[PDB]
Amino acid sequence: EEVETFAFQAEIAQLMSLIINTFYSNKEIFLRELISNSSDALDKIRYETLTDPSKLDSGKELHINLIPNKQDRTLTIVDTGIGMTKADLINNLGTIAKSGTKAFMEALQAGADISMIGQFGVGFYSAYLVAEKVTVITKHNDDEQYAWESSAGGSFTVRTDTGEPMGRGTKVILHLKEDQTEYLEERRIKEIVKKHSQFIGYPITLFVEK
Numbered sequence: 001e002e003v004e005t006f007a008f009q010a011e012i013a014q015l016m017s018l019i020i021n022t023f024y025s026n027k028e029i030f031l032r033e034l035i036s037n038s039s040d041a042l043d044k045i046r047y048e049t050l051t052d053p054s055k056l057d058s059g060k061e062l063h064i065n066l067i068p069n070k071q072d073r074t075l076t077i078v079d080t081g082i083g084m085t086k087a088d089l090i091n092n093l094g095t096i097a098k099s100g101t102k103a104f105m106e107a108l109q110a111g112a113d114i115s116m117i118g119q120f121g122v123g124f125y126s127a128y129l130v131a132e133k134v135t136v137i138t139k140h141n142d143d144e145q146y147a148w149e150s151s152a153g154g155s156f157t158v159r160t161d162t163g164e165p166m167g168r169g170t171k172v173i174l175h176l177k178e179d180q181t182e183y184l185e186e187r188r189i190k191e192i193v194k195k196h197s198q199f200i201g202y203p204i205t206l207f208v209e210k
């Protein structure tokens with residue numbers, strides 16, 4: 001019931017505004033970036049479980065699932081990585097935090113491809129190349145399950161999630177722009193993923209719709 005609204009740090013808001021309005025054609029990079037983020041979070045929990053096995057009491061499977069839902073026009077990317085506490089969610093998605101966002105925005109202004117975004121640590125925002133709204137549900141061992149959501153415009157919300165319990169991990173729900181529904185087609189997801197899966201050390205499974 002209690003929803004808190006935050007402003008993105010200015011640089012992020014600037015990045016998002018560019019992203020959400022660009023006609024940049026190679027929009028498929030968003031999937032590579034989300035998968036990469038998932039893989040990084042899976043690395044984190046897996047590492048932590050190397051000295052502390054109870055870390056996986058919330059789930060032993062380490063994987064990434066892709067779930068297209070044509071009826072709801074959403075593509076969902078779920079991982080069983082380390083997850084984010086409320087603080088991590090606000091800091092990570094609402095601020096420049098650990099990234100070279102400023103550096104990236106200068107290189108964008110210098111004729112650099114947006115596909116480089118992952119190299120500057122802000123790859124997540126490429127989701128707005130295809131989505132009008134993104135919801136991020138996450139569960140970290142040390143906190144409750146939270147839902148972050150933003151349709152850009154400069155603000156995002158965070159609330160405790162009353163939805164289906166995740167054991168641990170992060171689920172990114174992309175509410176797709178009307179003209180970007182190719183990303184709910186099995187054949188297109190397969191093509192994009194067939195290309196990146198060889199780099200990711202966790203199973204990536206596409207849920208074909210029935």
Ligand SMILES: CCc1cc(-c2n[nH]cc2-c2c[nH]cn2)c(O)cc1O
Pocket residue numbers: 034037038039040041042079081082083084124136138169170172
């Ligand atoms: C919404 C951005 C995002 C973050 C995570 C994540 N969860 N917990 C930690 C991370 C993370 C840290 N570094 C990269 N991803 C993740 O697992 C997937 C994602 O797409």
